[PDB]
Write an enzyme that holds these catalytic residues in place. Structure first.
Site, PDB file in Angstrom:
ATOM      1  N   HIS A   1     -27.201   1.161  14.490  1.00 46.12           N
ATOM      2  CA  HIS A   1     -28.223   0.462  15.265  1.00 46.12           C
ATOM      3  C   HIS A   1     -28.581   1.252  16.520  1.00 46.12           C
ATOM      4  O   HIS A   1     -28.856   0.675  17.575  1.00 46.12           O
ATOM      5  CB  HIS A   1     -27.770  -0.951  15.633  1.00 46.12           C
ATOM      6  CG  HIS A   1     -27.736  -1.901  14.477  1.00 46.12           C
ATOM      7  ND1 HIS A   1     -28.836  -2.628  14.076  1.00 46.12           N
ATOM      8  CD2 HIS A   1     -26.733  -2.240  13.632  1.00 46.12           C
ATOM      9  CE1 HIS A   1     -28.511  -3.380  13.041  1.00 46.12           C
ATOM     10  NE2 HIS A   1     -27.242  -3.161  12.748  1.00 46.12           N
TER      11      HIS A   1
ATOM     12  N   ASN B   1     -28.803  -9.839  11.792  1.00 45.75           N
ATOM     13  CA  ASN B   1     -29.934  -9.054  11.317  1.00 45.75           C
ATOM     14  C   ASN B   1     -31.152  -9.905  10.962  1.00 45.75           C
ATOM     15  O   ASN B   1     -31.144 -11.124  11.143  1.00 45.75           O
ATOM     16  CB  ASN B   1     -29.518  -8.198  10.120  1.00 45.75           C
ATOM     17  CG  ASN B   1     -28.379  -7.251  10.448  1.00 45.75           C
ATOM     18  OD1 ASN B   1     -28.138  -6.934  11.614  1.00 45.75           O
ATOM     19  ND2 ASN B   1     -27.676  -6.792   9.421  1.00 45.75           N
TER      20      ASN B   1
HETATM   21  C1  HEM Z   1     -23.105  -9.380   8.763  1.00 51.25           C
HETATM   22  C2  HEM Z   1     -22.675  -8.169   9.136  1.00 51.25           C
HETATM   23  C3  HEM Z   1     -23.236  -7.355  10.333  1.00 51.25           C
HETATM   24  C4  HEM Z   1     -24.248  -7.629  11.176  1.00 51.25           C
HETATM   25  C5  HEM Z   1     -25.177  -8.860  11.201  1.00 51.25           C
HETATM   26  C6  HEM Z   1     -24.359  -6.538  12.122  1.00 51.25           C
HETATM   27  C7  HEM Z   1     -25.274  -6.440  13.146  1.00 51.25           C
HETATM   28  C8  HEM Z   1     -25.244  -5.513  14.164  1.00 51.25           C
HETATM   29  C9  HEM Z   1     -26.251  -5.345  15.188  1.00 51.25           C
HETATM   30  C10 HEM Z   1     -27.545  -6.174  15.328  1.00 51.25           C
HETATM   31  C11 HEM Z   1     -25.873  -4.353  15.993  1.00 51.25           C
HETATM   32  C12 HEM Z   1     -26.713  -3.890  17.204  1.00 51.25           C
HETATM   33  C13 HEM Z   1     -25.937  -3.828  18.514  1.00 51.25           C
HETATM   34  C14 HEM Z   1     -26.958  -3.669  19.610  1.00 51.25           C
HETATM   35  O1  HEM Z   1     -28.161  -3.900  19.322  1.00 51.25           O
HETATM   36  O2  HEM Z   1     -26.582  -3.308  20.755  1.00 51.25           O
HETATM   37  C15 HEM Z   1     -24.596  -3.841  15.512  1.00 51.25           C
HETATM   38  C16 HEM Z   1     -23.843  -2.810  16.039  1.00 51.25           C
HETATM   39  C17 HEM Z   1     -22.557  -2.451  15.678  1.00 51.25           C
HETATM   40  N1  HEM Z   1     -21.849  -2.934  14.579  1.00 51.25           N
HETATM   41 FE1  HEM Z   1     -22.662  -4.193  13.123  1.00 51.25          FE
HETATM   42  N2  HEM Z   1     -23.386  -5.610  11.825  1.00 51.25           N
HETATM   43  C18 HEM Z   1     -22.681  -6.078  10.733  1.00 51.25           C
HETATM   44  C19 HEM Z   1     -21.622  -5.433  10.136  1.00 51.25           C
HETATM   45  C20 HEM Z   1     -20.700  -4.678  10.822  1.00 51.25           C
HETATM   46  C21 HEM Z   1     -19.327  -4.424  10.432  1.00 51.25           C
HETATM   47  C22 HEM Z   1     -18.692  -4.986   9.138  1.00 51.25           C
HETATM   48  C23 HEM Z   1     -18.767  -3.641  11.374  1.00 51.25           C
HETATM   49  C24 HEM Z   1     -17.324  -3.071  11.465  1.00 51.25           C
HETATM   50  C25 HEM Z   1     -16.325  -3.350  10.619  1.00 51.25           C
HETATM   51  C26 HEM Z   1     -19.779  -3.389  12.389  1.00 51.25           C
HETATM   52  C27 HEM Z   1     -19.620  -2.633  13.529  1.00 51.25           C
HETATM   53  C28 HEM Z   1     -20.575  -2.372  14.491  1.00 51.25           C
HETATM   54  C29 HEM Z   1     -20.403  -1.448  15.587  1.00 51.25           C
HETATM   55  C30 HEM Z   1     -19.150  -0.599  15.893  1.00 51.25           C
HETATM   56  C31 HEM Z   1     -21.718  -1.500  16.379  1.00 51.25           C
HETATM   57  C32 HEM Z   1     -22.056  -0.698  17.653  1.00 51.25           C
HETATM   58  C33 HEM Z   1     -22.148  -1.656  18.835  1.00 51.25           C
HETATM   59  C34 HEM Z   1     -21.989  -0.889  20.121  1.00 51.25           C
HETATM   60  O3  HEM Z   1     -22.008   0.369  20.080  1.00 51.25           O
HETATM   61  O4  HEM Z   1     -21.839  -1.544  21.184  1.00 51.25           O
HETATM   62  N3  HEM Z   1     -20.939  -4.034  12.016  1.00 51.25           N
HETATM   63  N4  HEM Z   1     -24.250  -4.578  14.392  1.00 51.25           N
END
Ligand code: HEM
Ligand code: HEM
Ligand code: HEM
EC number: 1.11.1.6
Lengths: 311, 680, 680
Positions: B66, B139
């Site tokens: 993202h 999302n």
């Molecule tokens: C239903 C499942 C998921 C949704 C809805 C989702 C949604 C999101 C969104 C919208 C962001 C954006 C953050 C921002 O805009 O600042 C993000 C970042 C991120 N997500 Fe996901 N994600 C999913 C699955 C996962 C999974 C399964 C993992 C780890 C096991 C993960 C790890 C991360 C990480 C490490 C970031 C970076 C945030 C940061 O750097 O502060 N995500 N996610």
């Protein structure tokens, strides 16, 4: 088979035919988390999960402050002669002498994901892995720069890069902030024209010349010096696109230049460049109507013709 | 009224002021310090080094996923007192206001990627409540690729560029991604949602939002209900076409982020309604799937949405980096009245988001950053850390202690309004590294999604899969995809295999069905409003065409639209040049009268623009399903490319006639009659 | 006026409050979240991970040098309007007050080392002026080891522990250090200062301070004078003896930092007078050395000190880490009215201090930290960076611009009160990697230093070198040391060589001389005040001694002293136990009346303290040169160890007679008759 990446063999890891492991060793399976019950919560004692995800979470490093978008390849540099009459450098010290190199081509204002075919100055950075140490020619595809003092680099780059309020626009000089700078700092006008020429939208990395831009010095063992300018002339020729073409290309393929460099090398058609120079006597520094310590100027070949030292 | 009021105290005005070092003192920073005229720069030029050092260190790591996104401040107002379902403070009284920040994103591209690449989009909201920050990180698609978080690296590694050359950028159109989709059939549901319009929204303001996971709402007595979070857009759901998106990725990579900016800046703040689905705890496995499965959604026929409030984004960031870039969302940012569930995907996320902040911010003190600070206050025994901005008065930073007199105090369900896990929750069974057998139906729901789409939308999904899988260089993976596609629908497997030049497998009736559900479609409904939508008026500097065009503009703008008047050069009424103009930037194109001159003859060939430019804008705009129009004599332009005014979405005649027709067409937004469907 | 007034905004009070997460919300953090009572801890316990994560990341790197230190807030008051010599704002008006922070340190030990180790000490002051922060970063010794900054790693690597075993901690008593001193004869001068009393000060408040480098003072017209910075202690110069310091390093590692804390907390704020030497720019090479040489000091007979003001440290930190630990001094923190000189050592420092902050603070934004922030205001075009605490209103972050209307503006000598390099400065010659021949006299000034010390002080320097060079295991290095010592003085080489069991080299009179200078001695002068000094009154719980001891204490405290009443256990008047007591903690020891019972017989053998404890405190205290005393019958204690009241520094008799005697002895502080001098 010289294989420029021969030194890099010692750090190559082959995971073929092997079982999954932790980063500290030991065989594992990493497709299921550890839960308490059939439909339970994940356990903090699942070391396998945390060790795997932690590396994923920390996969990112900062992108380059400039020239963030780029690509590169390994190569070999062969000298055409024994140039000890002008320089004591080992990699130019004997005929047919081979030095491993790495080159990275780039664009100046875009980030890691930007398009290769955006209008910008392009980078042409070469490293020489010589037997007397690393020597780097860090240069662009344009022989002149925007500014005459390095202390103005934050000011120049800030202007061309997106506006700090909305971070718009990406990899473009087409905004008020950039052209405010160009008008207010008239030194940038020369490079601006080079940007608006074909140089701002090359066909490929393999179709652009290269420049050290700065005047340097070559020194011999006795300590005699000549002012020098570095040139790279493409053995494939200079080619550029048209702006309406580049914009459409920026969408259909952002990886256009980097893919093209990949494919050529992969297809046995390795690109090649010739290294050429201009030599100026130290008393002739201000001879040609400008200071040779000014990077907003270049020295015409009617004043000093290019001599090739290698390829 | 202003969501950014807390942020005012840390705003810096450099206006009317002299240059300073970062440690104070007035300076000049345009010349280096040299020894002599044409001399070398001196190591004692502290002004140079202090200035450059900050520049050299300007970059922080981009988000691991993202990376490409944009955001804004806003206010969330509750519609009621929902203590019957949740003890949450921000939903605890009617008309209660909470400041929010929202960041929309794409999942696979880096910081410089295009907004208009086909990708899943992010919709992350923070509520700065008086009981702490609460984040709904979700999302624009209600389902995810995987059912366990431990596979997140595998999913992301495949979709992101190949590790050898880093090709391709922000695309799933490669062997590695489609290898994963076929080998992990769990990804199939979101894969279909990705290939629909959801993968290419018109704007951030024109997409719904989903929490995806099942959560829990808890009351003060400790009674819980299973919940799903929804965001329903007050502007309507809209999407682009793939051929449009590709060209748009080049002409404007910042299409979505600019549109969100312009909307707020022009007084047209976007809004969403917050809705939920409430499920009794005994009905978790009632509806044909496990509700702890994030690759499934609960149709609104089984449980309808109840709206609890509305959020409106009315303020823009002042600095993108300080606010948008540095913000850190976590699903573990939870408050009293909400709780997690045993969703194997959700459980893992809680670890990841907190841990990954250590990478991006280089320290444990990132919630001290102004945009991460809560409005409720922070009191604990945390000390030290890298870049600690606070000085702590309590020198007894341990619990339990006599010397601090019990402070900071310990809070729970009964005392201090503290957070509490749902009291009814249980753990039963063996400790296992497996997934429940209730998770093994990967094909039924993707069919359900496909079945509920308009015939053209179905064609879009298939046309998308044909395009993407065409880029796979491994024939066998494409064979593997068709088999997985076949288990969903034989028609789709048949239809896709045509483009790939392969043969369709024989039908499998195992998971086939004809069920249908509502709300999953984008095009079949009309937009609530045409406000902010953009019309491009092609005109010319020759004759009286401009004045005629000017009158067209003022009328159109009154209805809420934003009008751009395009011409050969920047005359009195000219907003944009033909060189700088493209069809992608406009929702509708209308040729002004007397502008026929540029569609043929010398007019189409000027030094002022690329040849065929006005003809292209009309050609592209028409072929992309947008409303097209001509005013009066302008009809020749439409027949220059072969478009008769008799058609649908095409309007020719007097100005008033054109205006009424176009505004009607914008409500339709996209005309699906202009796209070929299989078998026709 | 409380210098920490600016720091009030970032003070956090957790009193009367409930526990919170770092993102807000009330919690309980004493139990983990488990699956089934005696179950495993759950990954979804956000409360656990957030708490531990901050704990795990509490550590930041210690300073590369001067790691061990302590600090305090204060105010600097100007005595006049010094525009005649400097354009500096903080010295620009009479009675003008500027907030300061000072940190005292040792060079070679790490964060946990002893305060009472033999080392050079740091004396770093920040001036929070209204024209930006200005730092005088200096030592308690006017000379340095090396003449070029590029040799700084070589010096530090040598003095710090051996890379194979990390032995020894905070000591120069190993082969590598004395290998460097002998091989780089430039280090010899500071070496002598280290082996004198300066290497073991009594307190931070009892040492002078030096800028060491020659700087420049500039007036608004641009006229310059070369300057040397001095801090003269208003509490007097005092030092310990090595045998005392070693025992003190174990009994109290925090001796110096505690003493500074207690003094300020007790209303006795320490103070220094800021003095300078002004030298005409044409007189740089006048005084027998190059003034750009930092291995040299300028005698007060050639240029006497003129005091410009006084600074007093009256405030203690609230949090050590946030304030003392995180503060970042640089010599490059310079303002209008001050300028650098071509001192090759100083030139390098300017790069180093700025660069090293990137390591300790993990970011370029460390001057946004509250203790590093100026009071003058910061306006420039620096943006982004890791942990950016500000939001910038100006979206035109470049300086040659139309759109910001020229702001922030460029300031210089004439406009904006901006910084400027001295206009008379020039560069002449070839570009060279060599040092001037005026730097080649390494032996004359150490001789001058040695000559200017009292005979006992001379013995101390020699006694230190005997001890230190004894630890060198390589005989040839010790031979090399004798050769360098011989070039300074044959007597010193002779006297040291005895301990090493080597032979004194034949005299070299090339650098020999009998010159003398003032102010470099510690013991030859008496302390201006005995305030804050500590007396330990040895008593017992048996008989009437305690009441007798208590009465002695009340008398002593009015004069400014701090008295600790020691006994077998914590009775009514008892401050400390014998188990917890040692001679190192006291400036004077006095035995109360009737306390003789514990110096002999059963009294000296109690389970309440280690055997011989009271007898050692008197023995140690006497042998270390401190004033010792007995009251009335307490004479029995003094003759137990062989000390006659007839002696100097020893007082026995009536309480009133004893009190006057001790207070007199404390002004002398140390009695040098009790130490044997070579030849006798
Ligand atoms: C239903 C499942 C998921 C949704 C809805 C989702 C949604 C999101 C969104 C919208 C962001 C954006 C953050 C921002 O805009 O600042 C993000 C970042 C991120 N997500 Fe996901 N994600 C999913 C699955 C996962 C999974 C399964 C993992 C780890 C096991 C993960 C790890 C991360 C990480 C490490 C970031 C970076 C945030 C940061 O750097 O502060 N995500 N996610
Ligand atoms: C003739 C003038 C210049 C040329 C030819 C030039 C060229 C380049 C090139 C080709 C790169 C890319 C290196 C790579 O691909 O890894 C680069 C990066 C960079 N340049 Fe420049 N540049 C110029 C001006 C400047 C100036 C004046 C400054 C600073 C005062 C500067 C600071 C930087 C920095 C900080 C990077 C980042 C490198 C990294 O992160 O590894 N550049 N430059
Ligand atoms: C006359 C010569 C010198 C003096 C008076 C001096 C004094 C000091 C003092 C008092 C400190 C303590 C800072 C504090 O208390 O916070 C310090 C730290 C330091 N000094 Fe020196 N020093 C000298 C030589 C050098 C040289 C030649 C270099 C480099 C070429 C150097 C580099 C450093 C560094 C890197 C620190 C660490 C500061 C930090 O991490 O914040 N010093 N020095």
């Amino acid at each position: 088979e010289v294989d420029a990446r021969q030194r890099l063999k010692e750090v190559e890891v082959d995971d073929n035919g092997q079982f999954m492991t932790t980063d500290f060793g030991g065989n594992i399976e990493e497709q299921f988390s550890l839960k308490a019950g059939g439909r339970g919560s994940t356990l903090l004692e699942d070391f396998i999960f945390r060790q795997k995800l932690q590396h994923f979470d920390h996969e990112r490093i900062p992108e380059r402050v400039v020239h963030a978008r780029g690509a590169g390849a390994h190569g070999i540099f062969t000298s055409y002669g024994d140039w000890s009459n002008i320089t004591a450098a080992s990699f130019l010290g004997a005929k047919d002498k081979q030095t491993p190199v790495f080159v990275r081509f780039s664009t100046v204002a875009g980030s890691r994901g930007s398009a290769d075919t955006a209008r910008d100055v392009h980078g042409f950075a070469t490293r020489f892995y010589t037997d007397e140490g690393n020597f780097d020619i860090v240069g662009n595809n344009i022989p002149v720069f925007f500014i005459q003092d390095a202390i103005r680099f934050p000011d120049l780059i800030h202007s061309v890069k997106p506006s700090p309020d909305n971070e718009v626009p990406q990899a473009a000089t087409a905004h008020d902030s950039a052209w405010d700078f160009f008008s207010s700092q008239p030194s940038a006008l020369h490079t601006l024209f080079w940007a608006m020429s074909g140089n701002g939208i090359p066909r490929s990395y393999r179709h652009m010349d290269g420049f050290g831009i700065h005047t340097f010095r070559l020194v011999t063992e006795d300590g005699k010096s000549k002012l020098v300018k570095w040139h790279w002339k493409t053995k494939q020729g200079k080619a550029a696109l048209v702006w309406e073409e580049a914009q459409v290309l920026a969408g259909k393929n952002a990886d256009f230049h980097r893919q093209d460099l990949w494919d050529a090398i992969e297809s046995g058609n390795a690109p090649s460049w010739e290294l050429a120079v201009q030599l100026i006597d130290e008393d002739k520094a201000q001879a040609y109507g400008f200071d040779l310590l000014d990077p907003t100027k270049f020295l015409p070949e009617e004043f000093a013709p290019l001599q090739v030292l290698g390829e | 009224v202003d969501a950014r009021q807390r942020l005012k105290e840390v705003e810096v005005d450099d206006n009317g002021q002299f240059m300073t070092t970062d440690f104070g003192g007035n300076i000049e920073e345009q010349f280096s310090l040299k020894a002599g005229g044409r001399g070398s720069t001196l190591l004692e030029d502290f002004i140079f080094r202090q200035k450059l050092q900050h520049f050299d260190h300007e970059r922080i790591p981009e988000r691991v996923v993202h990376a490409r996104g944009a955001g804004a401040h806003g206010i969330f107002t509750s519609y009621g007192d929902w203590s019957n379902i949740t003890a949450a403070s921000f939903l605890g009284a009617k008309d209660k206001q909470t400041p929010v920040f929202v960041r929309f994103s794409t999942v696979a591209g880096s910081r410089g990627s295009a907004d208009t690449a086909r990708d899943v989009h992010g919709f992350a909201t923070r509520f700065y409540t008086d009981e702490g920050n609460f984040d709904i990180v979700g999302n624009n698609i209600p389902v995810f690729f995987i059912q366990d978080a431990i596979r997140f690296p595998d999913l992301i590694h495949s979709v992101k560029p190949s590790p050898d050359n880093e090709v391709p950028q922000a695309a799933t159109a490669h062997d590695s991604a489609w290898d994963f989709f076929s080998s992990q059939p769990s990804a199939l549901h979101t894969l279909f949602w990705a290939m629909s319009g959801n993968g290419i929204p018109r704007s951030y303001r024109h997409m719904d939002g989903f929490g995806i996971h099942t959560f829990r709402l808890v009351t003060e007595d400790g009674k819980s209900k299973l919940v799903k979070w929804h965001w329903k857009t007050k502007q309507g759901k809209a999407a682009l076409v793939w051929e449009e998106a590709q060209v748009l990725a080049g002409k404007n990579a910042d299409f979505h982020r600019q549109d969100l900016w312009d909307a707020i800046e022009s007084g047209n703040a976007p809004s969403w309604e917050l809705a939920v689905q409430l499920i009794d705890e005994d009905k978790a496995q009632a509806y044909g799937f496990d509700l702890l499965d994030p690759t499934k959604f609960l149709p609104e026929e089984f449980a309808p949405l109840q709206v609890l409030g509305e959020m409106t984004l009315n303020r823009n960031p002042m600095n993108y980096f300080a606010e948008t870039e540095q913000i850190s969302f976590q699903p573990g940012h939870i408050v009293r009245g909400v709780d997690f569930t045993e969703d194997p995907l959700l459980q893992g996320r809680l670890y990841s988001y907190l841990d990954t902040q250590l990478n991006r911010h280089r320290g444990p003190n990132f919630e001290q950053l102004p945009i991460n600070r809560p409005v409720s206050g922070v009191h604990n025994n945390h000390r030290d850390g890298q870049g600690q901005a606070w000085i702590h008065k309590n020198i007894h930073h341990y619990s339990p202690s006599y010397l601090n007199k019990g402070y900071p105090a310990q809070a729970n369900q009964t005392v201090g309004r503290g957070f509490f896990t749902t009291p009814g929750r249980t753990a039963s069974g063996v400790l296992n590294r497996e997934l429940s057998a209730t998770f093994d139906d990967h094909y039924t729901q993707p069919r359900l999604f496909f079945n509920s789409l308009t015939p053209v939308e179905q064609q879009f999904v298939i046309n998308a899969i044909r395009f993407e899988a065409s880029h796979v260089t491994n024939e066998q993976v494409k064979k593997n995809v068709l088999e997985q596609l076949n288990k969903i629908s034989n028609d789709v497997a048949k239809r896709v295999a045509v483009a790939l030049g392969l043969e369709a497998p024989q039908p499998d009736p195992t998971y086939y069905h004809n069920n249908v559900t509502r709300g999953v479609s984008i095009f079949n409904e009309s937009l609530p409003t045409i406000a902010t939508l953009r019309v491009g008026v092609l005109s010319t500097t020759k004759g009286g065409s401009l004045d005629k065009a000017k009158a067209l503009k003022e009328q159109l703008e009154k209805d809420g639209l934003k009008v751009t008047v395009i011409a050969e050069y920047l005359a009195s009424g000219v907003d944009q040049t033909y060189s700088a103009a493209d069809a992608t930037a406009f929702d509708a194109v209308v040729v002004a009268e007397g502008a026929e001159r540029v569609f043929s003859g010398k007019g189409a060939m000027s030094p002022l623009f690329p040849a065929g430019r006005p003809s292209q804008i009309l050609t592209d705009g028409y072929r992309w399903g947008k409303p097209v129009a001509a005013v009066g004599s302008a009809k020749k332009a439409l027949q220059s490319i072969g478009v008769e005014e008799k058609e649908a979405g095409v309007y020719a005649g007097a100005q008033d006639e054109v205006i009424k027709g176009v505004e009607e067409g914008l409500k339709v937004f996209k005309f699906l009659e202009r796209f070929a469907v299989d078998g026709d």
